Amino acid sequence: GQDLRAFVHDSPEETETTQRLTKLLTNSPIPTEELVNNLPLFLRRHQMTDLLSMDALYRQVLDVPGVIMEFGVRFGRHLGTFAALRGVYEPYNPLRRIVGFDTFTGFPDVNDVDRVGPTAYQGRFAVPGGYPAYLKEVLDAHECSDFFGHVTQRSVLVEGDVRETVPRYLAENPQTVIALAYFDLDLYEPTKAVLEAIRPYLTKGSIVAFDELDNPKWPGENIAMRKVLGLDHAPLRLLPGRPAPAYLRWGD
Amino acid sequence: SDSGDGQDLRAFVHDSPEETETTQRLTKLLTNSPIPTEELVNNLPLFLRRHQMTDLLSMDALYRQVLDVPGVIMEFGVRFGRHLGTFAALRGVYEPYNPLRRIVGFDTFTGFPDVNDVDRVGPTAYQGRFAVPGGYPAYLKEVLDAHECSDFFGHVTQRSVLVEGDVRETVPRYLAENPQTVIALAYFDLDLYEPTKAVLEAIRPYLTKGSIVAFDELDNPKWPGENIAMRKVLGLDHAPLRLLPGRPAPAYLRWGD
Amino acid sequence: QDLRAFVHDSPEETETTQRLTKLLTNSPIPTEELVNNLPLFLRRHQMTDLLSMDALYRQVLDVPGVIMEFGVRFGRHLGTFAALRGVYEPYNPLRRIVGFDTFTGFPDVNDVDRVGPTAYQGRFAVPGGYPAYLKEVLDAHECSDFFGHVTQRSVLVEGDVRETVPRYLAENPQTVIALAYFDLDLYEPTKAVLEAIRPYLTKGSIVAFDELDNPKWPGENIAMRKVLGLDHAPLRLLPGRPAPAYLRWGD
Amino acid sequence: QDLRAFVHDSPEETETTQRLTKLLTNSPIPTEELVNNLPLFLRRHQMTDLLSMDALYRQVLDVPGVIMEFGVRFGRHLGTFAALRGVYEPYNPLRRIVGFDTFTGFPDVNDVDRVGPTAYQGRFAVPGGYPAYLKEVLDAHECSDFFGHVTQRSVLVEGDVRETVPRYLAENPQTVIALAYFDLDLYEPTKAVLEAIRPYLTKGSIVAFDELDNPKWPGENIAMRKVLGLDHAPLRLLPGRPAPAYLRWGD
Amino acid sequence: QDLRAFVHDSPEETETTQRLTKLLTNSPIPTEELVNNLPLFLRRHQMTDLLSMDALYRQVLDVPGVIMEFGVRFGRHLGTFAALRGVYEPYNPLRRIVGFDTFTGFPDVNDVDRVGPTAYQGRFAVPGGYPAYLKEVLDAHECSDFFGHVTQRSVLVEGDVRETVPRYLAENPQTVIALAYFDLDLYEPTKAVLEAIRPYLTKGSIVAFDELDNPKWPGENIAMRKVLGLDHAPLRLLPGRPAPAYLRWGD
Amino acid sequence: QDLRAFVHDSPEETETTQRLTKLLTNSPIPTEELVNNLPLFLRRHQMTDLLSMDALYRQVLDVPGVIMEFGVRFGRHLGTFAALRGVYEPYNPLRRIVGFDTFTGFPDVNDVDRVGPTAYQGRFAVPGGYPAYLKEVLDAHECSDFFGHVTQRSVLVEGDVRETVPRYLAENPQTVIALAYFDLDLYEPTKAVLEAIRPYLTKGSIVAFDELDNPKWPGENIAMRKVLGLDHAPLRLLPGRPAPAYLRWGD
Amino acid sequence: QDLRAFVHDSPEETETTQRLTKLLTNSPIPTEELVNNLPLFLRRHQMTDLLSMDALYRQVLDVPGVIMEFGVRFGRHLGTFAALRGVYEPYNPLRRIVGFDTFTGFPDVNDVDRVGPTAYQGRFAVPGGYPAYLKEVLDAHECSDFFGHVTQRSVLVEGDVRETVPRYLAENPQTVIALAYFDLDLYEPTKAVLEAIRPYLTKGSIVAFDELDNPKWPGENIAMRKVLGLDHAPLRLLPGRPAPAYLRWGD
Ligand SMILES: Nc1ncnc2c1ncn2[C@@H]1O[C@H](CSCC[C@H](N)C(=O)O)[C@@H](O)[C@H]1O
Ligand SMILES: Nc1ncnc2c1ncn2[C@@H]1O[C@H](CSCC[C@H](N)C(=O)O)[C@@H](O)[C@H]1O
Ligand SMILES: Nc1ncnc2c1ncn2[C@@H]1O[C@H](CSCC[C@H](N)C(=O)O)[C@@H](O)[C@H]1O
Ligand SMILES: Nc1ncnc2c1ncn2[C@@H]1O[C@H](CSCC[C@H](N)C(=O)O)[C@@H](O)[C@H]1O
Ligand SMILES: Nc1ncnc2c1ncn2[C@@H]1O[C@H](CSCC[C@H](N)C(=O)O)[C@@H](O)[C@H]1O
Ligand SMILES: Nc1ncnc2c1ncn2[C@@H]1O[C@H](CSCC[C@H](N)C(=O)O)[C@@H](O)[C@H]1O
Ligand SMILES: Nc1ncnc2c1ncn2[C@@H]1O[C@H](CSCC[C@H](N)C(=O)O)[C@@H](O)[C@H]1O
Ligand SMILES: N[C@@H](CCC(=O)O)C(=O)O
Ligand SMILES: N[C@@H](CCC(=O)O)C(=O)O
Ligand SMILES: N[C@@H](CCC(=O)O)C(=O)O
Ligand SMILES: N[C@@H](CCC(=O)O)C(=O)O
Ligand SMILES: N[C@@H](CCC(=O)O)C(=O)O
Ligand SMILES: N[C@@H](CCC(=O)O)C(=O)O
Ligand SMILES: N[C@@H](CCC(=O)O)C(=O)O
Ligand code: NA
Ligand code: NA
Ligand code: NA
Ligand code: NA
Ligand code: NA
Ligand code: NA
Ligand code: NA
Numbered sequence A: 001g002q003d004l005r006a007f008v009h010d011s012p013e014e015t016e017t018t019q020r021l022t023k024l025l026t027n028s029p030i031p032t033e034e035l036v037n038n039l040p041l042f043l044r045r046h047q048m049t050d051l052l053s054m055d056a057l058y059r060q061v062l063d064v065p066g067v068i069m070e071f072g073v074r075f076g077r078h079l080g081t082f083a084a085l086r087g088v089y090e091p092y093n094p095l096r097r098i099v100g101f102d103t104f105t106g107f108p109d110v111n112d113v114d115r116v117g118p119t120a121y122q123g124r125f126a127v128p129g130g131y132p133a134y135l136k137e138v139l140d141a142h143e144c145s146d147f148f149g150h151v152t153q154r155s156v157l158v159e160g161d162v163r164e165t166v167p168r169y170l171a172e173n174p175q176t177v178i179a180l181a182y183f184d185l186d187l188y189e190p191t192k193a194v195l196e197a198i199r200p201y202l203t204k205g206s207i208v209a210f211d212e213l214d215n216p217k218w219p220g221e222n223i224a225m226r227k228v229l230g231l232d233h234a235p236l237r238l239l240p241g242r243p244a245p246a247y248l249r250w251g252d
Numbered sequence B: 001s002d003s004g005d006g007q008d009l010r011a012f013v014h015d016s017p018e019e020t021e022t023t024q025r026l027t028k029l030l031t032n033s034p035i036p037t038e039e040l041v042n043n044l045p046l047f048l049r050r051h052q053m054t055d056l057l058s059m060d061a062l063y064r065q066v067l068d069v070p071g072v073i074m075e076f077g078v079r080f081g082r083h084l085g086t087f088a089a090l091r092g093v094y095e096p097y098n099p100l101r102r103i104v105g106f107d108t109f110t111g112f113p114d115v116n117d118v119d120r121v122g123p124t125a126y127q128g129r130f131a132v133p134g135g136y137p138a139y140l141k142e143v144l145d146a147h148e149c150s151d152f153f154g155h156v157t158q159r160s161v162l163v164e165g166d167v168r169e170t171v172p173r174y175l176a177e178n179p180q181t182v183i184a185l186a187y188f189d190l191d192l193y194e195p196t197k198a199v200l201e202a203i204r205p206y207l208t209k210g211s212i213v214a215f216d217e218l219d220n221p222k223w224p225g226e227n228i229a230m231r232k233v234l235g236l237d238h239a240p241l242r243l244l245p246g247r248p249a250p251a252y253l254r255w256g257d
Numbered sequence C, D, E, F, G: 001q002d003l004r005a006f007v008h009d010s011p012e013e014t015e016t017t018q019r020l021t022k023l024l025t026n027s028p029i030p031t032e033e034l035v036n037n038l039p040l041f042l043r044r045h046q047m048t049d050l051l052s053m054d055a056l057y058r059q060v061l062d063v064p065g066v067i068m069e070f071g072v073r074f075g076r077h078l079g080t081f082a083a084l085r086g087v088y089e090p091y092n093p094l095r096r097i098v099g100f101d102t103f104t105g106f107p108d109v110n111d112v113d114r115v116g117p118t119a120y121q122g123r124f125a126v127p128g129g130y131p132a133y134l135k136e137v138l139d140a141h142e143c144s145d146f147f148g149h150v151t152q153r154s155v156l157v158e159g160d161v162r163e164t165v166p167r168y169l170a171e172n173p174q175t176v177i178a179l180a181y182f183d184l185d186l187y188e189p190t191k192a193v194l195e196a197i198r199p200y201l202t203k204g205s206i207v208a209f210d211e212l213d214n215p216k217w218p219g220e221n222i223a224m225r226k227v228l229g230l231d232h233a234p235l236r237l238l239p240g241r242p243a244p245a246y247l248r249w250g251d
Helices: A012-026 A032-037 A045-059 A077-089 A131-143 A162-172 A188-201 A220-228 B017-031 B037-042 B050-065 B082-094 B136-148 B167-177 B193-206 B225-233 C011-025 C031-036 C044-058 C076-088 C130-142 C161-171 C187-200 C219-227 D011-025 D031-036 D044-058 D076-088 D130-142 D161-171 D187-200 D219-227 E011-025 E031-036 E044-058 E076-088 E130-142 E161-171 E187-200 E219-227 F011-025 F031-036 F044-059 F076-088 F130-142 F161-171 F187-200 F219-227 G011-025 G031-036 G044-058 G076-088 G130-142 G161-171 G187-200 G219-227
Strands: A067-071 A098-102 A155-159 A178-183 A202-210 A246-249 B072-076 B103-107 B160-164 B183-188 B207-215 B251-254 C066-070 C097-101 C154-158 C177-182 C201-209 C245-248 D066-070 D097-101 D154-158 D177-182 D201-209 D245-248 E066-070 E097-101 E154-158 E177-182 E201-209 E245-248 F066-070 F097-101 F154-158 F177-182 F201-209 F245-248 G066-070 G097-101 G154-158 G177-182 G201-209 G245-248
Touching: A045 A077, A045 A178, A067 A077, A067 A188, A077 A098, A077 A131, A098 A162, A131 A155, A155 A162, A162 A188, A178 A188, A188 A202, A188 A220, B017 C031, B017 C130, B037 C011, B050 B082, B050 B183, B050 B207, B050 C044, B050 C076, B072 B082, B072 B193, B082 B103, B082 B136, B082 C044, B103 B167, B136 B160, B136 C011, B160 B167, B167 B193, B183 B193, B193 B207, B193 B225, C044 C076, C044 C177, C066 C076, C066 C187, C076 C097, C076 C130, C097 C161, C130 C154, C154 C161, C161 C187, C177 C187, C187 C201, C187 C219, D011 E031, D011 E130, D031 E011, D044 D076, D044 D177, D044 E044, D044 E076, D066 D076, D066 D187, D076 D097, D076 D130, D076 E044, D097 D161, D130 D154, D130 E011, D154 D161, D161 D187, D177 D187, D187 D201, D187 D219, E044 E076, E044 E177, E066 E076, E066 E187, E076 E097, E076 E130, E097 E161, E130 E154, E154 E161, E161 E187, E177 E187, E187 E201, E187 E219, F011 G031, F011 G130, F031 G011, F044 F076, F044 F177, F044 F201, F044 G044, F044 G076, F066 F076, F066 F187, F076 F097, F076 F130, F076 G044, F097 F161, F130 F154, F130 G011, F154 F161, F161 F187, F177 F187, F187 F201, F187 F219, G044 G076, G044 G177, G066 G076, G066 G187, G076 G097, G076 G130, G097 G161, G130 G154, G154 G161, G161 G187, G177 G187, G187 G201, G187 G219
Parallel strands: A067 A098, A067 A178, A098 A155, A178 A202, B072 B103, B072 B183, B103 B160, B183 B207, C066 C097, C066 C177, C097 C154, C177 C201, D066 D097, D066 D177, D097 D154, D177 D201, E066 E097, E066 E177, E097 E154, E177 E201, F066 F097, F066 F177, F097 F154, F177 F201, G066 G097, G066 G177, G097 G154, G177 G201
Antiparallel strands: A202 A246, B207 B251, C201 C245, D201 D245, E201 E245, F201 F245, G201 G245
């Protein structure tokens, strides 16, 4: 928009914390082999909040069959979270697949309704070339100590435009029930297409969550929700104190 | 020549002589206080009488009911801003980390712009009633900005927005300009039938199940417009209307219940 | 010592307070409408205090007896209770609000209270003749109470609590204390008052402290440890608020 | 037809009633203390009615709107509601109590109402000028209400409800109905008033009937079955009491 | 002494009471229908009393034993209990109601009772022969009880409770006390009766006080503090009502 | 066909039943004490029936209307209901118990009822003049009811329910049905009665079936599937008991 | 001495009882169907007893141990417990039912038991050879129990409980008592048995009294007050029922 200060942005202090913690992580006297035993030293409030919210969503579907999907993965923050939480809560559930969809090359197009702020452009949020192999190596590293680590395709990264890949994935996987659907695409067109595609695979109790439903910078999820279902189709909720995610329990 | 019996004005809610005395006494005690100037804002409950305290506690009760609902807080009918002040402070109490909880206040700031015959029950239903002074919205924006400058997210602007003009135009316009909008709490305090009806129709696509819709004068004989509006748009049994016990207003419903 | 290690206002909190002061005293709101729009000037920190007093009062609506504040200053909490009593208890003329203070600031301090630079005789003094003004304010709320014809529903007791609280209790053998709010900061009067009020509490009475765990004012904690022990009852916070700390007698 | 198959007083109920009437009119209690000792004369059957009106009113304390009674007679329930409103709602001047009656007894009956020997025009008539006396009684309660300066908080509407209820509603478009108490006995006015009040109920409003399943007075049942159906909402009793039967609108 | 600091009727309370007295004694309601319309004359303050007695009784419906009132005067509470016993306990002939009074007003007072100007020998006296009338009233209720054939289910015990309560208990070793209602006002007989009744309470018995925290009558408080302590059990109000204060024995 | 696939008494259940019959009819208990010791002769199977009837009755104590049994035989359940009504509802003279039967056994059967060897006309016939005796038993219970002076609180309707249930409803337009107990066994009369009673049920009324899922008597099931569907409401058991199966109307 | 102050049958209760006795003994029900229709003859007062025994038994379904009744007479409650054990505990062969009595009536009385005219030696005597018949009745129930092959699951112990209860316990050191039902009426044996059973109760065991607060039989109360105190545990009623009074051990 004109006044960029009306969009959510980091305070100078949030920026300082982030930069100091980056410096302390990369220049730490902690022995290299102990870094992964002390990561909360570097995990600041904003990111801790994200982790606790993913944990709250996952706990709500421990009694719901099916898979976890994220639309919009970037570097995989949420997928790493879900892989560890699946360890915590579901050692004996080899059917709880985690599926992450992304181009991995950033926004592949935008609609005029997404062009509110200056970051709505093709390629925004691109990750490095060959990143999906790295992210799959990370997920494989968590899986090798899972009780069901011998079962493969428990994590799947689907590369390309969700308008094509989500319907294709579903056609190839007619066993699918979706327990948790996490929408983090920002943009109107793919959100709408994916909401339409996933509907037959939800049960009553499935959770559908949105990372930017009510953000002025990214009105696409709301415009999509209003077109496909209506904002009062189901009860949208926050976890108190956190502006996102917004989430609904299908059928409520 | 013969005359009919007119309306008994005592049938409308009005201040008792004692309520008037309390109000006038506290006004004098505030304006002529021995408390040091800089401490007045640390002792305002000295001057906050039962009737106004009750309003504060009711706003707090409505806000607490939407702490787990996404979206914004809208007040239709702001006057000097009593409720917006209240919401700004409560948003600090409950939601330091929620920069999306916008507070949007709509008013002409020049009083009622017209009235309908159905609003013409008591003696204050006329154009301009409730006008606040020229330049008032700038002052109210200074007040809201003063609260915001100590908010955790005080660096994010447009978290309190005053929208000036007739809600029949400005509410549809605001919504068209803000397609991200979800409405968590919609506080109706316009009194009059026509703008109430128009705004109820406009806000519907932006409510979720669990959004609260509240009315300041729903069942008040002096201001039947909110009721007439609701009976036209939704029906009084569309959702369960509730009171906070012991308080004649607000009446509020939880959308979808 | 590092004064920064004591709780103090951020520059932004100071800015908000000063701007709201300026906007209240220079307002275009017509004079007779100011008391209809006070929340415009009631910032987060003070709103929180009001919500906490309301939470404490709501916990004793089913407990007999009176409300006492030890340490009144300008009367912020007494004004709050007077209005809340209107909201919740139109028909209870026995719910007396009793505020104790010298009204001339701390009358002495103990060495255990001298942690920060504001622990000195006379700190928090209010202007000469202030109690009459505070009583006029309380009388202004009472004149529209349902039981406004009953006097001594608010009582200001002037002097050192070491003498005045035992004297009040001896003069009022009907007393049950429903809510006892400790905001004296200092060790010695806190200890004396806790000892004095004990026989007038019931199970369910609330005892609250405004500075129990504050490094600047360790007197309430030193007093509680001497008289009862910190685990005599369950001390609690209202979540998100460092004070008050409060306990339900007998739990 | 056996009249013994209809509800009627046992010889013991009649003896209690007649004895209490004598003890009340010939009491040694000083005249100015009679109204401080009325439960002396309030027998189980009337006490039950009082407790039931209290239970219905408590269920709508969080529902906006007014209390209506269709079929007032001497005003037993109106006096009950006026006192309870004082107990529960000192600060609610919008809780109007509206009582509708011809005050001259049944104005007509339908053939379906003619089951027992008391279904005739004029049954339950009260004396000429009675409404002004009942209004004096309600005004006497109101002059000590917190909102006693607001008039028309108790309204007696005289005439046939088939005309007066629609007229009242037309003149009062602010109306929400929190509690609607049907005590007309007869089919036709019950049907007409049920139809009239529907747009003014909310989910959670209470609709109650005084004789819904009484063999002597099937008109409320016949009306309910025609307008709504008996399974439109859940009809309930207060356990142990044959009447009222009541439903929560929308359940 | 400021008599205005004691609870007293507002001019409007006095007006309501006097108007309702006039309207009851000059009523166009047919004489035989007065006892079917008593709520017309039952104002807020007295309705509140009735609802409180109902609340206390409801709490002992699962507790064995009898109901006792110490301090009956004209029998307001006994009338209420007799009707409620019919509503709740048709099949319980062991639920005796026992009322104790001199029926000649306070028989003595102690210095601690002499706070206000009504603490004198003979205050609250009722007329000569009043107990026989109150017994006739209670008998009138009982003649339509399911267990109306069992006598001595309502007992009036005349004399000073210091002698009569220990004597009643010695003559009735089957006694369990379910509800003990203290309304004597005075210190000495409250203390004596509290001491006497203790072996007959069970956990769950209710002990209630009519003036526990009233400045005019500190004797119940002084007595409680001597016999049990105010924190022996949790004293409670019914919210919004300054009395009774009651505790559940053993809590 | 294998008759052992139908429910039938074990040799031990037969021995219990025959022993207790002998012990009842040759008892050294004095004749006038037999009715004070009937549980001596009340075996597990029959005790279970009694407890289930009590569970169903307790579910409708807050629902208006009457109790109907379709299929009475000697009146086991009507006796049970008459006594329970005394236990729970002394003050409810509107809680009529209505029992329908030919009292001459099954009046016809349908091919779908002919699964076992007892589906024949006249099965379950009771002696000539039996309804007069059953009426004398019910009147014996009723003469110690609180409302024993009100007649027709127990009604025996003789004839084929296809004709008698619609006729009873037409003659009783006040009817609400709180509990409907189906024990006809046969398809056609169950279907006919389910259709007839529907306009007289409220949400919360209980509809119970004595043989819903028994292979010997599929007629209630066939009827339910025709009229409502088995998933119209939630059918339930009392855990541990194969019958009755019951639903709460509207759930 | 007014015998009317003791609980006694109304003329209507006597008429019910006498009618049902005649109807039982002159019944047109076939002899082999009498035990399938006993609720016909089971009036409200006895139905209540049955429901109360059921409520007590349900409270100990999660408590180990045996059921004991002190004071059996003809065995009303033992027959009830035998049937209930079948309903709830097919798979529990350790739930012994033990009934103690002289079976020749009261063997002596104490002066404290001599309040009414039935406190005499031999009151409640049952016929010579009665215990052998009661054992036949209990064995008839047991021969269709799932654990009917295990003997001694119901035991009749003949003699004075002062000797037989301590002897039984000494002989049965495995005993836990889940439910102890005191129905001896008399002071001395009640006290002796309360003393004896104490080491065999667990927290949650139920101790119940049939006449704890009955003026005619103060012995259970006197014994309680001597051995434990009436506030040792919380005594309760089943609401609406004067007896039994019961406590949960340890509460
Ligand atoms: N049509 C489309 N198909 C596939 N990915 C898309 C898309 N539109 C947007 N995206 C992806 O949406 C992502 C927002 S990805 C999200 C951030 C991430 N969940 C985190 O927690 O850090 C971008 O990586 C973008 O490439
Ligand atoms: N059509 C319309 N457009 C905008 N404002 C309107 C309107 N109709 C009524 N109003 C406004 O509704 C307000 C009613 S008074 C508002 C009171 C305020 N909420 C308080 O708490 O003190 C007036 O200021 C009036 O100007
Ligand atoms: N011994 C004593 N006797 C009486 N007052 C005392 C005291 N020691 C401390 N105080 C009082 O305790 C007060 C602390 S400041 C009280 C703040 C006030 N409750 C508010 O909410 O703003 C001072 O006014 C001080 O004079
Ligand atoms: N069509 C109609 N219009 C107005 N009143 C009617 C009516 N039909 C019946 N009524 C009134 O219904 C009343 C029934 S008696 C009401 C009893 C009263 N509620 C009490 O508690 O004592 C009569 O007074 C009768 O006049
Ligand atoms: N020592 C004593 N013995 C007996 N009665 C006493 C007493 N001391 C006080 N009383 C009685 O206590 C009573 C107080 S007034 C009782 C009010 C009554 N319960 C009501 O509800 O209206 C007086 O009647 C007085 O005579
Ligand atoms: N069409 C019909 N009309 C009337 N009664 C019928 C009927 N069809 C079956 N019945 C009756 O249904 C009864 C089934 S036996 C009922 C058993 C009884 N309720 C008990 O608890 O012991 C028979 O008496 C039979 O005559
Ligand atoms: N010391 C003692 N020893 C044994 N039995 C005693 C006793 N004192 C009293 N009893 C018995 O207590 C019994 C009281 S009557 C018991 C009634 C029985 N429970 C019923 O439900 O009908 C008498 O049979 C009497 O003999
Ligand atoms: N949805 C992402 C990115 C938002 C953005 O960059 O605007 C987040 O919450 O951090
Ligand atoms: N709704 C505003 C104004 C009412 C009016 O002026 O009538 C209030 O409650 O104070
Ligand atoms: N207790 C007071 C004063 C604290 C101080 O000055 O140290 C407060 O909370 O503001
Ligand atoms: N409905 C009124 C009157 C009934 C009648 O007279 O029949 C009552 O319950 O008393
Ligand atoms: N306790 C009695 C008497 C009070 C008095 O007279 O002082 C009451 O509440 O009315
Ligand atoms: N329904 C009856 C009869 C069963 C039958 O005869 O088959 C019962 O449960 O005993
Ligand atoms: N306790 C036995 C006998 C009572 C008696 O005979 O007094 C009963 O409840 O019937
Ligand atoms: Na976000
Ligand atoms: Na209002
Ligand atoms: Na503090
Ligand atoms: Na009725
Ligand atoms: Na009192
Ligand atoms: Na069956
Ligand atoms: Na008994």
